[PDB]
Structure formats: C-alpha cells, structure tokens
Amino acid sequence: SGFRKMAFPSGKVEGCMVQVTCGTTTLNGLWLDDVVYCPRHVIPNYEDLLIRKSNHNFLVQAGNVQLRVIGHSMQNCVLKLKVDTANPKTPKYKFVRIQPGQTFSVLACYNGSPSGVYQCAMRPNFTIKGSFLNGSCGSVGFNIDYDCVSFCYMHHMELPTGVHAGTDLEGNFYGPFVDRQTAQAAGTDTTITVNVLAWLYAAVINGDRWFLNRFTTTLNDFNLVAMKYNYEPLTQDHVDILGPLSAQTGIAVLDMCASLKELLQNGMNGRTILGSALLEDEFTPFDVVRQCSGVTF
Amino acid sequence: SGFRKMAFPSGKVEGCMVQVTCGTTTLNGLWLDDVVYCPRHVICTSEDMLNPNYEDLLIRKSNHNFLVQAGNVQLRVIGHSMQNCVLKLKVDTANPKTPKYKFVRIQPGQTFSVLACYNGSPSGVYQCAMRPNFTIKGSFLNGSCGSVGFNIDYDCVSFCYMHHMELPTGVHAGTDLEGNFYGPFVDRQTAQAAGTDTTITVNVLAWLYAAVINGDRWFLNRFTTTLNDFNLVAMKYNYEPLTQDHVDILGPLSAQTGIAVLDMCASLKELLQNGMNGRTILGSALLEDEFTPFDVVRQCSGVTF
Ligand SMILES: COC(=O)CN(C)S(=O)(=O)N1Cc2ccc(Cl)cc2[C@H](C(=O)Nc2cncc3ccccc23)C1
Numbered sequence: 001s002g003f004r005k006m007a008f009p010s011g012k013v014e015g016c017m018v019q020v021t022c023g024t025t026t027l028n029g030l031w032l033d034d035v036v037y038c039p040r041h042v043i044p045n046y047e048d049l050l051i052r053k054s055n056h057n058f059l060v061q062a063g064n065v066q067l068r069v070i071g072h073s074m075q076n077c078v079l080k081l082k083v084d085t086a087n088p089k090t091p092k093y094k095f096v097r098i099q100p101g102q103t104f105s106v107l108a109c110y111n112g113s114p115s116g117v118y119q120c121a122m123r124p125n126f127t128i129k130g131s132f133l134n135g136s137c138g139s140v141g142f143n144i145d146y147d148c149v150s151f152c153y154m155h156h157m158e159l160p161t162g163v164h165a166g167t168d169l170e171g172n173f174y175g176p177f178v179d180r181q182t183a184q185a186a187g188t189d190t191t192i193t194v195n196v197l198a199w200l201y202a203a204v205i206n207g208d209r210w211f212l213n214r215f216t217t218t219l220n221d222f223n224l225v226a227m228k229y230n231y232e233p234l235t236q237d238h239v240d241i242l243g244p245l246s247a248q249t250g251i252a253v254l255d256m257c258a259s260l261k262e263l264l265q266n267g268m269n270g271r272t273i274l275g276s277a278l279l280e281d282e283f284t285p286f287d288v289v290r291q292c293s294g295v296t297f
Numbered sequence: 298s299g300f301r302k303m304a305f306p307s308g309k310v311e312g313c314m315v316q317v318t319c320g321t322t323t324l325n326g327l328w329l330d331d332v333v334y335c336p337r338h339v340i341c342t343s344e345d346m347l348n349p350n351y352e353d354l355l356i357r358k359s360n361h362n363f364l365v366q367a368g369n370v371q372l373r374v375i376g377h378s379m380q381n382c383v384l385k386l387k388v389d390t391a392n393p394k395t396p397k398y399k400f401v402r403i404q405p406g407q408t409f410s411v412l413a414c415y416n417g418s419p420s421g422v423y424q425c426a427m428r429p430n431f432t433i434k435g436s437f438l439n440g441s442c443g444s445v446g447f448n449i450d451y452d453c454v455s456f457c458y459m460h461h462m463e464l465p466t467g468v469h470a471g472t473d474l475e476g477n478f479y480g481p482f483v484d485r486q487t488a489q490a491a492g493t494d495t496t497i498t499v500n501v502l503a504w505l506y507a508a509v510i511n512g513d514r515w516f517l518n519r520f521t522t523t524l525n526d527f528n529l530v531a532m533k534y535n536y537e538p539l540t541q542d543h544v545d546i547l548g549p550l551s552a553q554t555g556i557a558v559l560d561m562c563a564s565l566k567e568l569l570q571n572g573m574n575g576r577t578i579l580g581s582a583l584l585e586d587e588f589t590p591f592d593v594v595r596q597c598s599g600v601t602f
C-alpha cells in the first residue's frame with residue numbers, strides 16, 4: 001500500500017554530472033564517453049560568439065579533477081565539448097524526445113554537484129513545473145528502462161511565471177521558446193486527462209472508491225465536458241492505454257470517465273483522493289502500473 | 298522558483314543494496330564495509346510471526362543458511378549476530394562502494410528519502426516524514442522489507458530507517474539502523490495499530506514561510522497570537538503542540554521574510570478556521586507538513602520574491 005510521487009534511482013546519472021565554466025557563466029554539463037553536453041548559452045549570434053572561443057576557454061570540472069577540452073561544436077541549442085578523457089562511469093544510454101503528458105525524473109545540480117531528485121511531467125504548454133535556482137542550467141531529465149538511461153531534457157531557463165523551459169539532448173526546445181533574454185511567456189495550460197484517469201485507477205487499487213458511480217458515458221460526451229474544464233481531449237489511444245488498469249479493477253475507461261465528469265461538476269465535497277484535495281495529473285498509466293507492481297533497476 | 302517534494306540523490310545508497318535469502322524468505326539488506334544489515338524477521342516463517350522467539354530460531358542457523366547476493370555475485374557469510382530487531386551478517390568481502398556514513402535515530406517531524414527495493418534492486422526514490430504517531434506514509438509492496446531511509450547533508454549518508462512492516466491502515470513501521478523500532482511496535486503479527494495521527498505544526502509553518510519566499514502572501518493577516526492561545530486552537534484541529542524550540546528553529550525564516558513566528562501562527566489559525574476558499578498555496582489545496590524548516594532553507598532561495 002501507499003502511493004507517492006516516485007523518481008527513478010539517480011545513481012547512473014550522478015556519475016555523469018560535471019561543472020562547465022566559460023568566462024563569467026558557470027553551469028552543469030552531462031559527460032558521456034569523451035563528450036560533455038551543456039546549454040549553448042554558457043558562451044545573440046551564437047556562431048559569431050563561438051568562433052571567438054578556443055578549447056582552453058571552457059573549464060570542465062569532474063569532481064576535483066579538471067578535464068581537458070580538445071574540440072567543440074554546436075548542435076541546435078546544445079554545446080558539445082570534446083574532452084580528452086572518456087567517462088568511466090558512462091552508462092548504457094539513449095537520447096529521446098518526449099511528448100507532453102509524459103513524466104520523467106529530474107536530477108537538480110549546482111556547480112556539477114547533484115543536490116536533489118524529483119519527478120515531474122512535460123505540461124501540454126511544453127513547460128515543466130520544476131524546482132530550480134540560478135546555477136541549475138544543464139540539469140537533466142531522464143527515464144530508466146531496465147539498464148538503459150533515456151535522457152529526455154536539459155534545463156535552460158526560467159519563465160516569468162516561475163515555470164521552466166529546456167531542450168531535448170539534441171538541443172531542440174520543447175515549446176515555442178528561444179535561448180535569449182526577451183519577452184516570452186508560457187501559453188495557457190491544460191490538465192492531462194489520461195493521467196488523471198490513471199491516478200483515479202491507482203486510488204481504486206489502494207481502496208479509495210467513494211467517487212465511483214453506476215454511470216457510463218460516450219467518448220464524445222466526455223470530451224465536450226472536459227473541454228469546458230481546460231482538460232486535454234481524451235483520444236481512443238488513451239482509452240487503449242488504460243486497458244490493463246480497466247481490466248485489473250473491473251471499471252471500464254468510459255465508466256471511470258463518468259466519475260471524472262461528476263468530480264469536475266461537483267468537486268470533492270470535503271473529501272480527498274490519495275491524500276489530495278485536487279485531481280492529480282503527473283502520473284502516467286505506466287507510472288501507476290510500475291508503482292503498483294514493483295519494477296526494479 | 299518552484300517548490301517540489303525533493304529527495305536526496307540515491308546513488309550512494311544504490312551501491313549498498315543487496316538481496317538476503319533465508320529458506321523461503323527473500324528481502325533487502327544494506328551492505329556497508331564487511332557487514333550486511335537486514336530485518337531479523339528474514340529468519341521467520343509466516344506461522345512464527347504470531348509469537349516468534351528470535352533467539353531460539355537464530356541458534357539453529359549456521360552461516361551457510363544465509364544467501365547474500367550483490368548484483369550477480371554471491372557473497373559468503375562468515376558470521377552472524379542480532380542487535381535488537383536487526384540481523385548483522387558478517388561477509389567475506391568489504392563493499393568497495395561503501396560511502397562515508399553514520400547511523401542516526403530521528404525524531405517525529407523529521408524528513409528523509411526512501412530508496413524502495415525489491416530483490417536487492419532499487420526501483421524508486423521518494424521523500425517522506427516520520428509522522429508524530431511514529432509511522433511513515435510510504436509506498437511499499439511485499440518484498441520491500443530492508444529498504445532504507447536516509448539523508449545526505451554534505452557528502453555523508455545518514456541512515457535513519459529500515460523498513461520492517463505494513464500496519465492495517467496501509468502505513469509503515471520500521472527501525473533505526475541499530476534495530477530499535479520507532480513507535481510502540483513489535484516485529485510480530487500482533488493486534489497493533491497506529492495511534493491517532495496529528496499534523497506537524499512546525500513543518501506547516503515552515504511551508505507557509507516557503508510560500509512567502511516564493512511571492513505568495515494572500516493568507517497573512519494583521520493579527521498576532523500568544524503561544525498558549527495558538528496551541529489551544531491547534532489542538533482542536535489535531536495539530537501537534539508548537540513548542541518554544543519550534544519557535545526558535547523558525548527564527549532564521551522569520552528574520553528572512555520579516556514575519557514574526559507568532560504572526561505566522563495567526564495566519565495558520567485563520568487558514569484552519571476559513572479553509573483555502575478555492576485558492577492554493579505552492580500548488581496545493583491542503584496545508585503541507587512534510588517539509589522541515591531545514592528543507593525549506595535548503596530548497597528555497599536566500600532572497601524573498
Ligand atoms: C528570474 O529571472 C529569470 O529566470 C530570467 N533572468 C532575468 S536571468 O536570471 O537574468 N537569466 C536570463 C536568461 C535568459 C535566457 C536563458 Cl536561455 C537563460 C537565462 C537564465 C535563466 O533563466 N536561469 C535560471 C534557470 N532556472 C531557474 C532560475 C531561477 C532564478 C534565476 C534564474 C534561473 C538567466
């Protein structure tokens with residue numbers, strides 16, 4: 001029993017964090033094999049600024065050891081610093097681009113040293129509600145599948161509303177954001193419907209069934225209601241993905257949709273679901289199955 | 298900006314997790330130097346749990362009855378002893394990944410990270426607190442026994458909890474690393490239940506100060522209170538009594554935000570009376586009590602917004 005916001009074990013990622021300095025800016029880098037990946041803003045016409053830099057300008061620090069930069073190149077908004085030493089702690093890894101609604105673990109770092117780990121989700125507006133202070137740039141987001149680390153996010157900046165923006169590991173931003181000081185803001189956000197449904201199924205698994213009712217709904221009627229509450233539209237793929245949870249608990253996905261419809265129109269009425277007075281949307285259907293089965297890494 | 302429930306990086310603890318097997322039972326162990334620490338109930342059957350005589354069960358065991366597995370490598374047990382509710386298995390190999398560590402016993406209201414394991418393999422990490430009733434609201438399934446609770450302030454791991462059992466309400470009970478249980482609990486399948494739980498008042502106050510640091514002051518009022526009048530109100534809402542030590546501990550946060558501890562107590566009194574009225578504080582519709590004053594100073598900026 002118990003349901004918590006759970007992050008992946010961070011150890012395979014801890015062994016990759018380094019500190020990157022160039023002139024006045026100090027931020028974090030990801031050391032994989034003989035290349036260090038970091039945000040290009042550590043150095044705007046980025047190619048004009050980069051052509052003026054020599055390898056010895058970038059000071060790379062791995063623990064107490066200084067690494068020697070032997071080359072440099074830019075890929076989109078990420079800088080790739082070729083170093084003389086291969087990381088002996090390099091894990092089996094991949095660079096993956098995620099979709100909004102998907103979740104991941106964030107290892108927050110300052111000065112190349114990891115300070116904390118938390119779980120979060122890519123919001124439909126392509127921002128993340130993270131916990132970052134100045135010096136956190138270069139912190140990475142990841143998932144683990146058996147022994148392989150899937151790197152999906154690198155932190156670049158904070159928006160005026162306190163939310164965060166960044167790129168995949170190939171330097172492409174999530175969202176209509178750019179890496180410079182300008183007037184930019186997050187768009188209106190929506191609730192991840194498929195995730196709230198998964199979390200209602202997790203509550204049923206943990207013995208919380210007060211919100212269940214005898215009613216069902218059509219997918220079209222549910223989406224007409226959901227659009228009125230700033231909820232993301234629910235697709236047939238979402239319904240198929242919740243299949244296992246629907247068969248395990250005995251509650252059909254459209255049957256659970258009718259419960260969510262009533263929660264949106266009437267509220268919780270002094271009650272909580274899994275210790276929460278709000279409907280939670282940062283657990284995917286796979287996070288629910290993984291936590292209520294015990295998958296190890 | 299932002300405020301998340303944040304756990305310590307788990308890597309130093311991952312390198313210590315092993316699998317321990319005794320007959321039909323399999324749970325997790327903590328391998329530090331040449332000793333593996335695990336719950337003593339690994340020697341019990343399900344029947345034994347009603348009234349187990351651990352000393353009688355242990356005297357019948359030899360070193361080769363205990364199978365220890367570190368990854369794909371089998372460790373050889375060369376000795377064994379019991380310290381309270383923990384079993385200490387002397388092994389023939391020191392853990393090369395042993396970090397700088399301490400065994401610390403914590404007080405209720407203290408927070409820590411939990412590395413949940415199954416079969417000596419870590420599956421997840423989450424942050425939690427020792428409740429006033431000495432239980433923890435964790436996320437554990439069968440096979441999680443031996444999972445540990447820890448804090449990593451600076452570069453030293455402070456082990457404070459080892460998981461032993463799930464109580465009937467779904468909450469969890471365990472011991473410090475010296476085998477002494479937190480709470481009036483026993484490693485026995487007895488009629489035992491968690492006492493009535495209360496809210497950690499000093500933690501909710503710290504979290505209200507974190508919200509003020511991040512720019513939210515809607516909940517403040519023009520009133521103050523005496524400590525005695527605050528506690529008379531707090532007791533009525535199942536809140537732990539606030540002591541002079543708690544007031545002293547909130548000093549730094551008070552001086553940083555400019556809000557006196559008894560003035561912040563007045564806002565809490567009002568929040569308990571009125572509720573949130575459709576509003577949230579740091580993305581939460583409930584008053585959060587699993588962030589200590591120390592966690593707030595650690596996670597939040599040194600400059601108020
Ligand atoms: C609060 O002000 C800002 O976030 C923006 N700034 C005015 S700044 O701090 O000077 N600024 C400019 C800027 C412009 C573009 C890019 Cl790609 C990055 C950056 C930086 C940035 O975003 N760094 C931060 C990241 N995460 C978290 C933060 C928390 C606090 C303060 C900087 C944080 C710095």
Ligand SMILES: COC(=O)CN(C)S(=O)(=O)N1Cc2ccc(Cl)cc2[C@H](C(=O)Nc2cncc3ccccc23)C1
Pocket residue numbers: 001338346437438439440441442461462463464465483484485486
């Ligand atoms: C509803 O809870 C249960 O089913 C727990 N039990 C009644 S049990 O599984 O029969 N049980 C009794 C027992 C009594 C004392 C001690 Cl020290 C240990 C143990 C064991 C125990 O507690 N192991 C578990 C630990 N954490 C989490 C769990 C989750 C699920 C299932 C076992 C979990 C086994």
Ligand SMILES: [Cl-]
Pocket residue numbers: 402403404407
């Ligand atoms: Cl303590």
